[PDB]
């Protein structure tokens, strides 16, 4: 039947990525191996997400086989970096790698669902950019929320511009980037399950990522987002929900602006939050030159630390969820952060600042912003 040979590292890389994207019907425990010409295809489908990896292989005899994904994943990961021989004989797969020999039961290929077709390609960007942007924004998603809309990452496309956004009602993360568009007037706005997307961009890496939503009047119409690159491709179903309007929350200016060091603020938060009541909040008292970070109460413990701040405006006391705050700080990927305040229990805007009065102070334009709601003082 199907029998092929390829290096372990290639095989394992292909198999793991199918298993990282998959990750009901007992037939969906299997993964399909297909050998044609001089290439090996590894496919998995779960009806929500499909994943398929193509690699070079010595195909001694073309064909298809369906085996346990979990098991194949475990074995190919634990295999020495040697050539792997695979041979389908009867209703069993023999796998050989040096002195180690494996014999696995198969499942009938006829029962395996067909993997959905990818839409037409909509645009491409570097995988690294995609990975960074998506991990930046996904942190704000209401992953594991019971309200489907909050579980998505919004993707807005207009020509060469992509805007990514996510929210859980308490923080809102927005990332703008440039890509290579399939055409100058392509226009779309879709909503993509955040965890699936984050997982794809994570294993995405190679040089290019290509996004497939379709083209022309049919963009988004298939209800699928295709992601491909480096021999790999996947599909995820789009969320059928509308995303909140958010641009009206981004002020032209601020009543106060605070600029400081990201690394030291993150550590100081970790430190004072050690005594935070259920980790519910940390207080920040901004004034010229300094900010006092504090937490806790007298019954369990109090903690405070004064940090240097480049501060503009009148003194300001505002409190945050310490975890939401550090999530935002970690999403900046820059040395310094600015906080833009409108104050009066309105959100604070966190923007990335590079290492190198009276107001109001105009906002500075950035490709990333993390909008963070305060909490009320107890």
């Amino acid at each position: 039947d199907l029998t092929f040979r390829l290096l372990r590292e290639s095989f394992a890389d292909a198999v793991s990525w199918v298993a990282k994207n998959l990750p009901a019907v007992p037939v969906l425990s299997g993964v399909l191996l297909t050998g044609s010409d001089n290439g090996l295809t590894i496919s998995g489908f779960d009806y929500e997400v499909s994943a398929e990896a193509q690699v070079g292989a010595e195909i001694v005899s073309p064909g298809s086989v369906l085996v346990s994904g979990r098991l194949l994943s475990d074995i190919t990961r634990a295999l020495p970096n040697k050539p792997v021989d695979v041979h389908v004989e009867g209703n069993r797969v023999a796998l050989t790698c040096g002195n180690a020999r494996f014999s696995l039961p198969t499942m009938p290929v006829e029962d395996y669902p067909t993997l959905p077709t990818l839409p037409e390609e909509t645009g491409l960007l570097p995988a690294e950019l995609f990975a960074e942007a998506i991990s930046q924004v996904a942190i704000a998603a209401g992953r594991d929320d019971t309200l489907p809309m909050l579980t998505g990452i919004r993707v807005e496309i207009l020509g060469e511009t992509v805007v990514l956004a996510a929210t859980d009602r308490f923080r809102l993360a927005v990332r703008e980037l440039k890509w290579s568009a399939s055409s100058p007037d392509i226009e779309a706005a879709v909503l993509v399950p955040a965890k699936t997307l984050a997982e794809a961009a994570k294993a995405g890496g190679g040089s290019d990522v290509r996004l497939s939503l379709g083209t022309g009047p049919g963009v988004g119409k298939d209800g699928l987002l295709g992601i491909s690159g480096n021999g790999k491709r996947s599909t995820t179903r789009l969320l059928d929900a509308e995303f909140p309007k958010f641009r009206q929350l981004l002020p032209t200016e601020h009543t106060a602006v605070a600029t400081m060091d990201v690394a030291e603020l993150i550590e100081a938060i970790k430190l004072v939050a050690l005594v935070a009541d259920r980790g519910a909040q940390v207080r920040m008292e901004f004034a010229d030159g300094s900010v006092r970070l504090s937490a806790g109460a007298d019954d369990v413990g109090r903690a405070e630390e004064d940090l240097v701040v480049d501060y503009a405006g009148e003194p300001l006391t505002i409190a945050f969820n310490p975890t939401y705050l550090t999530d935002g700080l970690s999403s900046l990927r820059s040395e310094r952060v600015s906080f833009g305040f409108t104050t009066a229990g309105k959100p604070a805007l966190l923007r990335p600042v590079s290492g190198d009065g009276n107001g109001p102070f105009p906002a500075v334009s950035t490709d990333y912003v993390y909008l963070l709601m305060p909490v009320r003082l107890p």
């Binding site: 009602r169 308490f170 809102l172 909140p244 929350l249 969820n321 309105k346 959100p347 909008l371």
Partner: peptide, 10 residues
Amino acid sequence: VPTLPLVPXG
């Protein structure tokens, strides 16, 4: 714990 002033949303 107020939410963001998303309309609809809060």
